[PDB]
Symmetry: D2
Subunit: 116 residues, 4 copies
């Protein structure tokens, strides 16, 4: 399976957040953010298949979740453009990284869940 | 100033939640809940003056926040009925507790900032 | 499968919150809280099999997640006794309820995810 | 008073996060991020005086917070490496914004309370 997964909940409607675009970036040697993977959440609010064990090498990764487009599709103009998290992926730690985001228009949390 | 302050905010609108009823109870030695203090939030979403240092001794306190009436006044019939925060106070000596309840119709977040 | 499920994450350690006790109550005619179901989260932070479609009738339910014992087991001082979620189950309403809780010692959210 | 205020709190300790670096940028017409204002949170966890009602015009603003240094100064090595939020301000007239970042080592919450001047 992908070592990096994303799950998104809509805390206003009490449902998975479906069709949310997610972009992942990796810091390059020149300190710029290089695009790494993208996708959108399914009907369960999950995004699987972003990357592979081979490709998900150690590095600094940025996960950006496009929450503004999600809310705007529901008719709402929310506070932020995105939810984001930056973290270092490490070969020593637990293998699987799940970014869990809980969304409301004016408050949201992004949590990294690192497991085996 | 009251050693217990409660603030209520709306996560959907990004606004203070005004006129929200807040009821505080203290657990008695016989395990029942005794009414302890109550009030309604102000225009800033804050409820000041609930109690005093002299009254607010160690104990288990329950803060019940009438979130149902608040949503209903905005034309929403919420899923999350009433918010309830239960905590032990002053166990290491008197502290000032600010409890913030952030509301949506299907979720709430409770945050405590505890100072000297 | 149980029409009421609970999933719990630890935001301090970035992990599922394992072995968290959960107690569910249903409001009785005398306005008291009847014990209804209980269990504890598994290694995945999920609690399955709490109740059945037959047992879970309309009513007012309280889900208490025993977060104080969880933080004590980790050596981390907590704020609350537990996280509570009170809701009315109406038959016109939702078919499956999942309570998703994100926990830190001094801040926590509980979200009802209502699905079919 | 500044119509943009940023507050940072610690969800592990239940305390204000003191002396935390906060950077604010505003998106220019050429799509670059221009430095707008910065400072460090005070003993209440709040950073006051960032801007004024005259200077804080409509635009896209970015608030970036050095949460990693905050945790390290407390003896904690965090997993999340910073906090960052981008938002359009004053799109429907001037507002006052309080942005609160609530931190733990593996998570953060961003909340905006938006009021009239
Ligand atoms: Mg004692």
């Amino acid at each position: 399976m992908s070592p990096l997964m994303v799950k998104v909940l809509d805390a206003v409607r009490g449902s998975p957040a479906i069709n949310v675009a997610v972009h992942v970036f990796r810091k390059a040697a020149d300190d710029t953010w290089e695009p790494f993977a993208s996708g959108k959440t399914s009907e369960s609010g999950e995004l699987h298949g972003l990357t592979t064990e081979e490709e998900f090498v150690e590095g600094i990764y940025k996960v950006e979740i496009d929450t503004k487009s999600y809310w705007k599709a529901l008719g709402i103009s929310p506070f932020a453009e995105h939810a984001e998290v930056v973290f270092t992926a490490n070969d020593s730690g637990p293998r699987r990284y799940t970014i869990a985001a809980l969304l409301s228009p004016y408050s949201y949390s992004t949590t990294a869940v690192v497991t085996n």
